[PDB]
Amino acid sequence: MLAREAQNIQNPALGAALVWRFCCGYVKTNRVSAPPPLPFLFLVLPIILHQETSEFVKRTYKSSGLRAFAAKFGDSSVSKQDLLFQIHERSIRWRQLSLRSIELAVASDLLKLQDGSDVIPLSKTKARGLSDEVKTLMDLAEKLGSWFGELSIHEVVTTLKVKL
Amino acid sequence: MYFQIRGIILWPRNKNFKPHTIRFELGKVNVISGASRTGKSAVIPIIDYCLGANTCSIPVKTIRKYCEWFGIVVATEQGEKLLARKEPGNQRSTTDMFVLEAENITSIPIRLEKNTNVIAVKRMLDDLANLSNLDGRPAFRDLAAFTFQPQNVVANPDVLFFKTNTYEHREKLRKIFPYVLGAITSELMAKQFELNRIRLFLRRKERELKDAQDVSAQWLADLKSKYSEAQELGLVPKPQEQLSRKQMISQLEEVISRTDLTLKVTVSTISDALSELNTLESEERLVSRELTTMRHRLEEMNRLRVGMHQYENALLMQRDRLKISGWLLSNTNDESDCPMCGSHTDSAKQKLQALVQRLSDVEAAVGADAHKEVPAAFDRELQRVTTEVANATERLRAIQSRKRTLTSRSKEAREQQFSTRRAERFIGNVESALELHRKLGSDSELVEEVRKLKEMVQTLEKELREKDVELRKNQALRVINAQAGNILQGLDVEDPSAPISLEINDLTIKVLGDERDDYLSEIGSGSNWLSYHLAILLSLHQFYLSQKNNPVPSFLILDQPSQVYFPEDVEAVRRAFKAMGNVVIKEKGKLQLIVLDHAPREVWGEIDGVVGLPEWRDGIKLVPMEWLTGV
Amino acid sequence: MYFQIRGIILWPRNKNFKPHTIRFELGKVNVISGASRTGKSAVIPIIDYCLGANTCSIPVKTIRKYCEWFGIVVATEQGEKLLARKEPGNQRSTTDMFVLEAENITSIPIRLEKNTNVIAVKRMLDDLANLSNRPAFRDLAAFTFQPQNVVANPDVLFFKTNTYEHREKLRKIFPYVLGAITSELMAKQFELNRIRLFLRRKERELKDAQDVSAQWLADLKSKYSEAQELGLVPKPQEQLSRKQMISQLEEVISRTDLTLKVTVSTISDALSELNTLESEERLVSRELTTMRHRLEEMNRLRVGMHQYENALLMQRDRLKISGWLLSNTNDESDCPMCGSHTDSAKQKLQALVQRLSDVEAAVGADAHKEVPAAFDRELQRVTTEVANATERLRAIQSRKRTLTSRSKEAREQQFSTRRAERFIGNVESALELHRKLGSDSELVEEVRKLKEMVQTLEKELREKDVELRKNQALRVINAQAGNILQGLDVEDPSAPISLEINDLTIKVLGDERDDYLSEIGSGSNWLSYHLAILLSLHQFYLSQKNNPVPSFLILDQPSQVYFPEDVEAVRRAFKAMGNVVIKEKGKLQLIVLDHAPREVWGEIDGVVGLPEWRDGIKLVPMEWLTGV
Amino acid sequence: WYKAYVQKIDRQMVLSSRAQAPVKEKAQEYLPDKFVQQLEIIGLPYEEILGAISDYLMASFDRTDWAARGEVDETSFDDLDTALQRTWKNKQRICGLTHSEKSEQDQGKLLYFECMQFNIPLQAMSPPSHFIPGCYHILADSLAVGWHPNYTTQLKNKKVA
Secondary structure (H helix, E strand, O other): OOOHHHHHHOOHHHHHHHHHHHHHHHHHHOOOOOOOEOHHHHHOHHHHOOHHHHHHHHHOOHHHHHHHHHHHHOOOOOOOHHHHHHHHHHHHHOHHHHHHHHHHHHHOOOEEEEOOOEEEEOOOOOOOOOOOOHHHHHHHHHHHHHHHHOOOHHHHHHHHOOOO | OOEEEEEEEEEEOOOOOOOEEEEOOOOOEEEEEOOOOOOOOOHHHHHHHHOOOOOOOOOOOOOOOOEEEEEEEEEEOOEEEEEEEEOOOOOOOOOEEEEEEEOOOOOOOOOOOOOEEHHHHHHHHHHHHOOOOOOOOOOOHHHHHHOEEOOOOOOOOOOOOOOOOOHHHHHHHHHHHHHHOOOOOHHHHHHHHHHHHHHHHHHHHHHHHHHHHHHHHHHHHHHHHHHHHHHHHOOOOOOOOOOOHHHHHHHHHHHHHOOOOOOOOOOOOOOHHHHHHHHHHHHHHHHHHHHHHHHHHHHHHHHHHHHHHHHHHHHHHHHOOOOOHHHHHHHOOOOOEOOOOOOEOOHHHHHHHHHHHHHHHHHHHOOHHHHHHHHHHHHHHHHHHHHHHHHHHHHHHHHHHHHHHHHHHOOHHHHHHHHHHHHHHHHHHHHHHHHHHHHOOOOOHHHHHHHHHHHHHHHHHHHHHHOOHHHHHHHHHHHHHHHHHHHHOOOOOOOOOOOEEEEOOOOEEEEEOOOOEEEHHHOOOHHHHHHHHHHHHHHHHHHHHOOOOOOOOOEEEEEOHHHHOOOOOHHHHHHHHHHHHHHHHHOOOOOEEEEEEOOOOOOOOOOOOEEOOHHHOOOOOOOOHHHHHHO | OOEEEEEEEEEEOOOOOOOEEEEOOOOOEEEEOOOOOOOOOOHHHHHHHHOOOOOOOOOOOOOOOOEEEEEEEEEEOOEEEEEEEEOOOOOOOOOOEEEEEEOOOOOOOOOOOOOEOHHHHHHHHHHHOOOOOOOOOHHHOOOOOOOOOOOOOOOOOOOOOOOHHHHHHHHHHHHHHOOOOOHHHHHHHHHHHHHHHHHHHHHHHHHHHHOOOHHHHHHHHHHHHHHHHHOOOOOOOOOOOHHHHHHHHHHHHHOOOOOOOOOHHHHHHHHHHHHHHHHHHHHHHHHHHHHHHHHHHHHHHHHHHHOOOOOOEOOOOOOOHHHHHHHHOOOOOOOOOOOOOOHHHHHHHHHHHHHHHHHHHHHHHHOOOOOEOOOHHHHHHHHHHHHHHHHHHHHHHHHHHHHHHOOOHHHOOOOOOOOHHHHHHHHHHHHHHHOOOOOOOHHHHHHHHHHHHHHHHHHHHOOHHHHHHHHHHHHHHHHHHHHHHOOOOOOOOOOOEEEEOOOOEEEEEOOOOEEEHHHOOOOHHHHHHHHHHHHHHHHHHHOOOOOOOOOEEEEEOOOOOOOOOHHHHHHHHHHHHHHHHHOOOOOOEEEEEOOOOHHHOOOOOOEEOOOOOOOHHHHOOOOOOOOO | OOHHHHHHHHHHHHHOOOOOOOOHHHOOOOOOOHHHHHHHHHOOOHHHHHHHHHHHHHHHHHHHHHHHOOOOOOOHHHHHHHHHHHHHHHHHHHHHHHOOOOOHHHHHHHHHHHHHHOOOOOOOOOOOOOOHHHHHHHHHHOOOOOOOOOHHHHHHHHHHO
């Protein structure tokens, strides 16, 4: 009753598609086409399903790199350096939701969870008839994956001030 | 702040050779035996260019021709970082840069490509130094005055710091010293800002409270004449006993509260117009009720109209996030297996079935015509309510017109109207006065607000006064002077036992001679000027290292220190290098010195903490001869 | 200003012998050879002491050892004056001096006595400069002396500019010396600046006072809207201010006969306003909630900041995926994910946990260092908008409550033509406070007055003239210096030079970059630049009328960059000095303390040097040194 | 004779056409939902029922929006729910103890008008006026709270009726 709205608006059947796009975009720009580490999968929804950070991801275009996205938060004209630290806390808060999204993702043959703390994305699948609004979250997830691809673990952890 | 240089790197312009690397050592005196030629060194230009300089001072004759990219490696509290800048080429300056980070850099890319721009690197350095917070704080570049001693400044008695030849630069540095000394801090700036805001708030609060208190008090003074006037009007049944403020006030509230006033007019005698006037008054009292009810109904109807549309929007915003569960149904396979081990498991199928069922329910709820019927009925009722309100207003107009005509005809009607008008307005004035007097009671929030704001101002004043920016500075300078003296006990000077002082405003040293105090400008020979420069700068860097969060990078560059001597003299230079070594070893790897000098290996050979390798030769020779011959 | 030094005189410490004497030629370069490194620097100490310097520095070891009274004879436009000072020897400085004046003082008293104090002679000199009793005589000593430290020094150009106060004074003086601004206008400009900075503060205080709190706006707006609904006043097509509202309400009150004209339109308008208030309230409440939660999280992170350690770094918990997985696993199910139950599932879970924990350990090995973070700017800003929005929310709620409650029982009887009176009986009372709030006149008058004074002073000073004249004078000085440099030895005798006032130095305009004298070597060039600039300035000061700077110059060992070819360069500088002196009809005097060979000079026009004038210990007569 | 009937059917249509999931039993017929029925048990006037409907709809929209902004999650609402339940139990007991003598509908009016005015604890938030009533109306629609101590029996009577 007091949770129907939230349960409908944050259902894992959307997180699964978001993670699928994130992996498919991470493999493309990886140096040796290796699929991403497992921990980074937990950082997809806590950034795309929060409006104030999704707008930042939307503004700086592709060739800016993750560093520009991180820097926008500390800009004097914006002054939102606190949200950067809160990204990690919010990611902690939503462990179960992302976990279920990953479960649905693999069980639908969208990702193969190798026995190496790694997840191979899959090609040859396309949806149709979706709404315009989600059709932007999908591209945002893909762009974020591409940004994550170009860098290494240590650089990403330092840039987003995450603690794994 | 831990920030040191590990090495320099060059990328040959001709794409047939490996990049050339010159590797320094952390936490020791790096004696680069070089500069043995006319012209300037090639190291300082590169370091300055890589850290975001606006111009290229690199020798264009013999270096800029052979290499395409320049770079340095810096060890910082966040690990190691490689910075690189593209060779300007046909323009005096350029902004392309490349950045890399790691725990310990070990591989240098053969090919470099643009990664960022100079402004980004300046922002990065500012953040690394804590200089992006709320004069107060400098920028990174302004700190150069503490870490560089050019050739014509290292033994010059009329100049002590790099970049102090213009009015603007001198004022900048003079404003900056207070922050670097640790007197000013971010928290004090924030506290000052907050205290100013609180004071500005309290001013206005007190002003308005005082005005309201005046207005209420002057009326509470006239309360007695007001009460006598009330008794005259007959609204208050006149008492004859003595009454205090409480009794008169109370009586006034009961008078106000009545559904009607005590008309001091007899009813046994009725004229022709009195009954008509009373009937009209009662009829208007009646119509008021219907009009109010219609108003209430119309308001609620509009509010419902808004709520319905908002809920309509919510439904679609809820459906468009669930729709995708329909597509996830078509890709799931006939079998059902565990995500981890592949064991038979249908949980995902149940989840997708539940979601598709919810989607179906929501889509059914969005039925159009079933809902589109409701607006028709809603509109049908809105018009009825509006027309009824219009009729009520028309009746009110008619009754008012009749009352006006009747009171115009007779005479007693006019007198009765005058009496009622006077009594009503008197009651209204008393009502407002009593309300405003209620607001300003002892427990009224309007008093506690001011009291708490005063308390906050008191506390903030106490805090900001508990730690002053002058005593901090004066206590900081004492230890710097003492350390400088201790260092100076070892070097060569005319009078080692005379303490010195550093003058913040003057930007120089002041030797406290027994008979007189002499500025550094009036002490002879370079052997003394070099000693004083060394002592002051080393003591300053020790201080900056012994304190937390200071933004001064912990490395120092000394260009050609021994030129005062011709590059009997061995002992003095040996003592200088030995003092440098002692200071650097005492800091346990947190302080780096880079020295460019000609002095042979026999003066700094066997000194602890001093290292110099013969491969580092600078100026031209750092370019491999292979490139010099190929190009 | 005509002012030149004609002679120096000494008296023995023991009053048994006649006074000694040295005299220079007036209006001619005077070269004083001697013995270097023999304490020969006595002329400058003597002159500085005689002219009222605050501390004595005459050599106690050799000269003061035999003499106790000193003095100098100077020829000024008022006539000729002998100024003498006393050196008891037990104190650094003394106030006792003797003064004599005449049209020409040939006689020399054999004994001296107190005749004037330091303050009196300083007043006399300041008056002699024709200054306003702010410039002074001593302050002008930056255009006459050139010690050994400064004559060929590429860092310092003018004497007495090492400290902060001295250069501050000199930077204030230059506009006066250049003749750009008269004495009175400097006094006016100080007042103008003070008023300029004061007026802005007063205007800010006016603006601060004019504001008013929230609930007091709310009450007035509520009352006006209620009056509007009854039909007493017309609908305002544009948002009104407190002034218009109060004026209209006062007009309504004074009406002799009210006439309610409630109509459907009037009722509907109030409800529309109510809807708008609803929307604004919901929006502002959402924003306030967002800010409040943001602030709470920031505060919690600060709690993790300071209670961890004094350093600006946090204490925070880790994500611990593997630990959280194995903790959430219970005996009822082998799979946190799917809830299944199988031993193979347990083994797979353990293996995945171990691999993920290995990855976690690797990254933790990478990430061990602390995580400092400073976010005071955001904290202050957030704390600002929290209050700024709370106020507005309270105002909106208060406004809405009345509109909505005018449909309850409280208004069953208000629409009648009778109780409307009571409403007026409130409005005319309420205004008694509303007229008093948010208004003041005194500040307005003060602001207008200050603005008018500012306009008057600005019209009087006309600060364009000073800049124009200063620029033209600088152009003239630069041109003269460029013309003079042709006769000297420099690396490039064609590049024009410029004088920088605020920097107090020279700037040589290079081919692409203009270089200060500091960053140019070839030490012999600095001497040429100094000579050029100083001589040009002194030639300019005589070209005007009533200038304060005395007309004489002192140089100390200009040739020290040419250890005693060199003999071909020194002569160029000396003959340029002579030419400049000759070109001024004897109005300008130079004194030089130098030790070059006599064969380098003497044959030039305007130069003079006599075999006597030996200084140092040889300054004292040989008759003395035994019984004095 | 005709305006009264058209008015009543318009009232039924306006009042009873929506729910979390339109029940097919109440699709062709306009049986009022549980909360509106619980209100009509005490016989509140018509306009008050309209106000309650608007409160419920607006609260639903607000919860949808806050969830769709990522500002709230599942666990946020559970503490609020349990707090509402506990508070309503305490106030129901207190109202029963204090005014057991009054007519039962009077007790319903009382509880209905005290439960809404009292504040409720929650997070660092600024709930507008029309939020708590909507949550209470959702709870009532589920027959977890009531505006009558024996609302359940009257509700069986109504469903029979």
